[PDB]
Structure 1
Amino acid sequence: VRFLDGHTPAYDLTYNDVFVVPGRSDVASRFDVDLSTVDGSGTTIPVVVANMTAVAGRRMAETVARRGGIVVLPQDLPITAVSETVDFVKSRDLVVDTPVTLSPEDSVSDANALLHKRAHGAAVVVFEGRPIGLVTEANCAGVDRFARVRDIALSDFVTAPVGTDPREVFDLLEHAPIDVAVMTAPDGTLAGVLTRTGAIRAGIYTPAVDAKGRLRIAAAVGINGDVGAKAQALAEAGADLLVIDTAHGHQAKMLDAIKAVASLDLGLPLVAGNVVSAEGTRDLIEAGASIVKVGVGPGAMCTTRMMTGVGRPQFSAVVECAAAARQLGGHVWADGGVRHPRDVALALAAGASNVMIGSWFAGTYESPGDLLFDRDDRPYKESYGMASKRAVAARTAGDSSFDRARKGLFEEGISTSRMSLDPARGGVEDLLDHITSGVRSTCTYVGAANLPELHEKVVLGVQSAAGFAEGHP
């Protein structure tokens, strides 16, 4: 990357320290920019969801993959749950979404709870697999909390067979009272739902699919235990990408795990991390990793800085590591500390092929945690860290229960953070709109038609603390 003349500070830079200078541009429209990645992940937008139990679930995996991202399932997820999750995602339709379903005998109180597991604003009542009506949050108000859903359900709703073009479904919903269109399978049973915004998004985002045309999903593994056997099972379970994840990636045990997995010739892209140095990036690639995950310190759930003083300002870390990886034909994932679209854009400008987002996506309907409301009625969800699941552990074979608590005494605890939902647009797809709208706008400011040109053409500069505060928050 190029920095403005004289911008060579005596410190490393975070996302807040830098800005992009616009260049001469012939890229007319935001939609002229190609946001697809070149690192082999298969993502059509530069967004990866972090391997965190607070974020990476079956609903998140489905929703983000349909919009071109990919979700890394958290490590130490039992292999039966992995295969169960993979089969669910890869059986999802590429356009039509999976709705919340209700029994006619479910209570209004139960319906109010389940409605916010998706962003559709309505749930479908099903009897013998067939949709019989729609349930909205409005129908649940002013009625007996334990009245049956059969009573308040709306019988009249827009329906269309699955496979109908999004533009047509969009037109059917124009004068509908409810913005949900129930999609019917060939035999008349429930296929899914498509909303007007969901139909628009189908003509904006390209789904991230495997060779069979099914949604992409990824899995992560720690460097403890038998890493080759675990990675092999994940591959056999259907994962399209593997992530070898640990807190300190520049470590002998991580180099072993990469070689053990690379030697199995699984044929999937191999991500490994995390490191913040060019030396660590090189060693991990030479061990057989095609993609290096970068980030030690910036994570929202990461207390490494205050515990150990170890860390690195993320933007500087991504610049040095992406340069090192590109010299060797590899790629870099910017992992941790992403709070705003500009963070994604700056990480791509810095040379990352993909940006990994964790805590930000906990504050969405589709994240696995329960929807909560703080003192001020504001909706939120809690993000929490993976703790010891990212740490190196000695062999617990033949471990006294004394030793179990001995090793547990020093191990990092699970910290918590409140992630509030946008009171208007609380779905993860709204944040993808947020993110990709910003990055597309960055490319038009830079003069780039795609992500490769963004990193090639970007001009960057450094600002003081008052510099970041320019504009509107």
Structure 2
Amino acid sequence: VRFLDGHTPAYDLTYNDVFVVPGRSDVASRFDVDLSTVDGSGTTIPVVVANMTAVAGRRMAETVARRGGIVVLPQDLPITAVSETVDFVKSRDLVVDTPVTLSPEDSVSDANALLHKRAHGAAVVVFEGRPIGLVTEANCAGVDRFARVRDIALSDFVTAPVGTDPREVFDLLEHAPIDVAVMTAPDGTLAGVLTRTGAIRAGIYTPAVDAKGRLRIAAAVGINGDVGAKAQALAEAGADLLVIDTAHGHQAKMLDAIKAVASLDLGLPLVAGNVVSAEGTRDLIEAGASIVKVGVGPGAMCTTRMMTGVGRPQFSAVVECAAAARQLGGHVWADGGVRHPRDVALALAAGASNVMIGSWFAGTYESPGDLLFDRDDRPYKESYGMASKRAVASSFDRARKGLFEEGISTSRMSLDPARGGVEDLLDHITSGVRSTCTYVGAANLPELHEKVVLGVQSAAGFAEGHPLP
């Protein structure tokens, strides 16, 4: 990267300590920018969902993969559940979203609770595979909680066949009381649901698909036990990319696991981490890792800096690791510390190929965590860190080992009323990155890295501009 003359601070830099200087540009609009990555992950947008049980899930994986991103399944998850999740993700449609399905014998409370599992805002009642009505929050209000779905006054729905152009579906929903359109197969069974916003997004985001035209998905493995057997089993399960995640990636165990995984010649890309030094990236790449995971400390649930003082500011670590990888022909991923699209844009300008977002996506409908309401009826969801699952591994021995184990951190993630779904956050981040590219004057991410000019600002410089949310 290029810095302004005289901008050589005597300390490492974070996302808040840097800014992007505009340059001469010829990009007319945001839509002229290509956001496809070149790291081999197959993602058309530089967004990756972290491998956390509070974030990664079936609905989240499907929604992110449909819009071009990828989701890494949490490590140590049972192999059967991984198989079902992969099959469900790869069995989805590339355009039509999967709605919440209900039976006429279901309870009203179950319908109300399931209404928030998706951002569509409505659920499709299915009888013998055929839609028969719609359930919305207005219908369940005032009704006995233990009545049946068939008692609920099911509302009419706009129906269109599958394969219809999204423009027509958008047109039919212009005056529809409910902004959902059910897509029915030529047989007549339920194929999915579509919305005006979804129809608009269909023409903007290109889904990330494998060689067979199915949505991509990734799985994570630990370094304890037989790493090679687990990696081979997950590769056979249909995973498109493998991640070997650990708290400290610059250790012997990590390198041995990398070598064991690479010896199998599975053919899938390998992601390893985490390191915050050039030597660590050189060691991981030489061991056989194609992509290096970068970041130790900036995790929103990571307490390493408070427990140990060990860590590094994200920006300097990312730039150093990216330079080291590019030197050896590799790629790096920015992990942790993302709160705003500014962080993603700066990480991309730093030299990273992808930006792994973690606890930010936990405050969405698609997150596996159950929706909760605060004292002021404000919706929120609880998120937590992976704790010991990222660490290196008789009741007495169990208690002795768990005495020194780090506690599970927790925090509340509020849901934005206008950005309840993860697709809204994806739109936010993509708009920010596209605006950054237009300001720099780059048509693609490699040009963004090549042409960017960075600067250093003080504490007062960050507060400049509109008050942060």
Which TM-score bucket, shorter chain as reference? over 0.9
Please give the alpha-carbon distance, in whole angstroms, between the structure 2 residues aligned to 1:30 and 1:151: 49
Indicate the SS of the match to 2:116. Answer: helix
Q: Kindly report the root-mean-square deviation, in angstroms, between the aligned alpha carbons of the 2 structures.
A: 1.1
- Comparing 401-410 with 299-308, greater Cα deviation is found at 401-410
Q: In the TM superposition, what is the alpha-carbon distance from 1:146 to its structure 2 partner?
A: 2.5
The Cα offsets for residues 33-55 of structure 1, whole Å up to 9 and x where unpaired, read as 00010000000000000000000
- Comparing 154-163 with 288-297, greater Cα deviation is found at 154-163
Please give the alpha-carbon distance, in whole angstroms, between the structure 1 residues aligned to 2:440 and 2:419: 29
Indicate the SS of the match to 1:232. Answer: helix
The Cα offsets for residues 166-191 of structure 1, whole Å up to 9 and x where unpaired, read as 11211111111111001112321111
Indicate the SS of the match to 2:381. Answer: strand
Q: In the TM superposition, what is the alpha-carbon distance from 1:229 to its structure 2 partner?
A: 0.6
Please give the alpha-carbon distance, in whole angstroms, between the structure 2 residues aligned to 1:152 and 1:71: 37
Name the residue aligned to 1:309. 309
Structure-2-length-normalised TM-score: 0.98
Q: In the TM superposition, what is the alpha-carbon distance from 1:143 to its structure 2 partner?
A: 2.3
Please give the alpha-carbon distance, in whole angstroms, between the structure 2 residues aligned to 1:379 and 1:49: 22
Indicate the SS of the match to 1:139. Answer: helix
Indicate if the aligned counterparts of 1:125 and 1:153 stay in contact, CA closer than 8 A: no
The Cα offsets for residues 366-413 of structure 1, whole Å up to 9 and x where unpaired, read as 00000011122111111101111000119xxxxxx3111111111112
The Cα offsets for residues 423-466 of structure 1, whole Å up to 9 and x where unpaired, read as 22200000000100000000000001011111111111111111
Q: In the TM superposition, what is the alpha-carbon distance from 1:245 to its structure 2 partner?
A: 0.4
Please give the alpha-carbon distance, in whole angstroms, between the structure 2 residues aligned to 1:166 and 1:329: 41
Q: In the TM superposition, what is the alpha-carbon distance from 1:139 to its structure 2 partner?
A: 1.4
Q: In the TM superposition, what is the alpha-carbon distance from 1:250 to its structure 2 partner?
A: 0.5
Name the residue aligned to 1:345. 345
Please give the alpha-carbon distance, in whole angstroms, between the structure 2 residues aligned to 1:12 and 1:249: 21
Q: In the TM superposition, what is the alpha-carbon distance from 1:417 to its structure 2 partner?
A: 1.0
- Comparing 170-179 with 54-63, greater Cα deviation is found at 170-179
Please give the alpha-carbon distance, in whole angstroms, between the structure 2 residues aligned to 1:308 and 1:185: 58
Please give the alpha-carbon distance, in whole angstroms, between the structure 1 residues aligned to 2:455 and 2:155: 59
Name the residue aligned to 1:287. 287
Indicate if the aligned counterparts of 2:345 and 2:436 stay in contact, CA closer than 8 A: yes
Please give the alpha-carbon distance, in whole angstroms, between the structure 2 residues aligned to 1:20 and 1:182: 44
The count of corresponding residues between Structure 1 and Structure 2 is 467
Please give the alpha-carbon distance, in whole angstroms, between the structure 2 residues aligned to 1:190 and 1:153: 20
Q: In the TM superposition, what is the alpha-carbon distance from 1:102 to its structure 2 partner?
A: 1.1
Please give the alpha-carbon distance, in whole angstroms, between the structure 1 residues aligned to 2:378 and 2:156: 32
Indicate the SS of the match to 1:117. Answer: coil
Q: In the TM superposition, what is the alpha-carbon distance from 1:119 to its structure 2 partner?
A: 0.2
Indicate the SS of the match to 2:68. Answer: coil
Q: In the TM superposition, what is the alpha-carbon distance from 1:165 to its structure 2 partner?
A: 1.6
Indicate if the aligned counterparts of 1:224 and 1:392 stay in contact, CA closer than 8 A: yes
Please give the alpha-carbon distance, in whole angstroms, between the structure 1 residues aligned to 2:359 and 2:434: 23
- Comparing 169-178 with 356-365, greater Cα deviation is found at 169-178
Indicate if the aligned counterparts of 2:183 and 2:192 stay in contact, CA closer than 8 A: yes
Please give the alpha-carbon distance, in whole angstroms, between the structure 2 residues aligned to 1:467 and 1:260: 48
Please give the alpha-carbon distance, in whole angstroms, between the structure 2 residues aligned to 1:110 and 1:232: 39
Indicate if the aligned counterparts of 2:277 and 2:320 stay in contact, CA closer than 8 A: yes
Please give the alpha-carbon distance, in whole angstroms, between the structure 2 residues aligned to 1:153 and 1:182: 18
Q: In the TM superposition, what is the alpha-carbon distance from 1:154 to its structure 2 partner?
A: 2.9
- Comparing 132-141 with 208-217, greater Cα deviation is found at 132-141
Determine what percentage of the aligned residue pairs are the same residue. 100
- Comparing 248-257 with 150-159, greater Cα deviation is found at 150-159
Name the residue aligned to 1:90. 90
Indicate if the aligned counterparts of 1:378 and 1:423 stay in contact, CA closer than 8 A: no
- Comparing 168-177 with 346-355, greater Cα deviation is found at 168-177
* Structure 2 gap segments, 5+ residues each: none
Structure-1-length-normalised TM-score: 0.97
Indicate if the aligned counterparts of 2:135 and 2:155 stay in contact, CA closer than 8 A: no
Q: In the TM superposition, what is the alpha-carbon distance from 1:321 to its structure 2 partner?
A: 0.3
Please give the alpha-carbon distance, in whole angstroms, between the structure 2 residues aligned to 1:47 and 1:409: 37
Q: In the TM superposition, what is the alpha-carbon distance from 1:152 to its structure 2 partner?
A: 2.6
The Cα offsets for residues 113-144 of structure 1, whole Å up to 9 and x where unpaired, read as 10111000100001111110111111121222
Please give the alpha-carbon distance, in whole angstroms, between the structure 1 residues aligned to 2:234 and 2:283: 24
The Cα offsets for residues 78-112 of structure 1, whole Å up to 9 and x where unpaired, read as 11111110000000000001111111122222211
Please give the alpha-carbon distance, in whole angstroms, between the structure 2 residues aligned to 1:156 and 1:420: 33
Indicate if the aligned counterparts of 1:13 and 1:316 stay in contact, CA closer than 8 A: yes
Indicate if the aligned counterparts of 1:245 and 1:390 stay in contact, CA closer than 8 A: yes
Indicate the SS of the match to 1:138. Answer: helix
The Cα offsets for residues 307-338 of structure 1, whole Å up to 9 and x where unpaired, read as 01000100111000001001111000000011
Going from structure 1 to structure 2, the CA distance change for 1:149 and 1:269 (only over 3 Å counts) comes to same
Please give the alpha-carbon distance, in whole angstroms, between the structure 2 residues aligned to 1:417 and 1:323: 34
Q: In the TM superposition, what is the alpha-carbon distance from 1:153 to its structure 2 partner?
A: 3.9
Name the residue aligned to 2:16. 16
Please give the alpha-carbon distance, in whole angstroms, between the structure 2 residues aligned to 1:85 and 1:110: 23
- Comparing 18-27 with 105-114, greater Cα deviation is found at 105-114
- Comparing 407-416 with 247-256, greater Cα deviation is found at 407-416
Please give the alpha-carbon distance, in whole angstroms, between the structure 2 residues aligned to 1:77 and 1:149: 34
Please give the alpha-carbon distance, in whole angstroms, between the structure 2 residues aligned to 1:191 and 1:361: 27
Indicate if the aligned counterparts of 2:222 and 2:390 stay in contact, CA closer than 8 A: yes
The counterpart of 1:406, out of the listed 400, 406, 424, is 400
Indicate the SS of the match to 1:254. Answer: helix
Indicate if the aligned counterparts of 1:274 and 1:294 stay in contact, CA closer than 8 A: yes
